[PDB]
Amino acid sequence: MTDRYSFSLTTFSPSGKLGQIDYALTAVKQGVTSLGIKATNGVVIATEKKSSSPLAMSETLSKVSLLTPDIGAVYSGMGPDYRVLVDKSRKVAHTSYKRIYGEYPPTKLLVSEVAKIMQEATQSGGVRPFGVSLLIAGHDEFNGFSLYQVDPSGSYFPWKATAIGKGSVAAKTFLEKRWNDELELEDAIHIALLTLKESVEGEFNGDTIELAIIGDENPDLLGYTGIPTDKGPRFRKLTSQEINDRLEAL
Template sequence: MARRYDSSTTTFSPEGRLHQVEYAIEAINNAGTSVGILARDGVVMASERKITSGLLAPAKTSEKTYKLCPHATCTVAGLTADANILIDQARLRAGRYAYQYQEPIPIENLVEHVCNYKQAYTQYGGLRPFGVAFLFAGYDETHGFQLYQSDPSGNYSGWKATVIGANNQAGKSLLKTEYGVKKETDGDEMKTDDPTGGEEIELPDLAEACRLAVKVLNKTMDGAVASPEKLELFTMSLDEEGNCVHKILNAKESGEIIAQVEAETQSAGDT
């Protein structure tokens, strides 16, 4: 039945589905895993590196993490060629906004622009959806550090911690149990319509978020042991002057975090 409706992006099936968009999402689910975690003092993003050949020369710049403007970055899961088009659109929008208004673009405004561009490719004939999902990390003075996820349909949503790419459901399950410290509120302040049951999540710091990101990748990498060559850790924080600092951890720094996670795992197993 689907064959009658999956040849066109703009044709709905009787169930109200756009099959080409679902195929694009499935392509992302087979891509390398990427994790985004919001911390008290910044944002951590970790990505799985797919090493296809030992003869392949390492990229001079990151293949997973891209700087959009001084206060915004994104991580890619899916087709890098498709991602390059959207990254150029995001950089162009950020530059034009700064030129027109003489201030940095709000993060959600930037994400919305990219997602509107993606949505157009699901609405007009002769086009196909972009086979790429993004995690956007950024900072603005109004809302502080923010983390957004978007998919090929043009949907986007804000998250405290999320996973895209292969085995993302397993990664999200781990984040639900490991992310933050849940503190119970006083009974007098507890609201009956509170979905968390009166619990508040305290955000981790950058170091804790880095360790949690490595734990998630360990769970989603199909039994492969995490190593500095197989993953990329990125942090965004503020310096003393309030400027955003983008940093991709080198092999030594990543190795130290991986060793800490392994030590915690072993100690937990001993108990």
């Protein structure tokens, strides 16, 4: 019953820092590496499934999440914060967009909505910031493909390619080396896999790696035929098997 801390828990310090936002960023550093690479005809988001137990079933925990049929997200930092951000993000895409315009939000707008949700946790009374950074990749008719990073402060930035979390500094270097503007999606998935191998401690296979693409429309994933102007999701989670095929040619 009733909150006592109706004041901001993120305040400015004598030097101009916002401590809690700094400390959430330090949490993102401690988290498992995730990355995004933009190609000419798609985006790839990838991360490692770091398991709590060998007795756990890692298929039941998705780090990669569909946000709308053409937008997907991955994170580094505190898992549960991600999970609830994903719920709010899906809802907001409906309440603030689809229920109004009859179509799904373009990438930047949804990212902007997510940013707002995180911005608020930085200003409101009696809350800490979210302990995550997200990578949001998507497609829309008028903007093409995009990749955005969203930070605990509420800040977002568009990226050609980037990595967040543990090995992020080395992985970002490995991406500046490898990225160009002629990359096909298949090349990008291949680079994503290479970059992720430096980060992975243990086994590196389709069971321990999580990887999704924003590529082309998947009419077989639509669930109905008949309406010719509805072609299906561009978001697609690659299977364990699919990953392994690209590791034997890696």
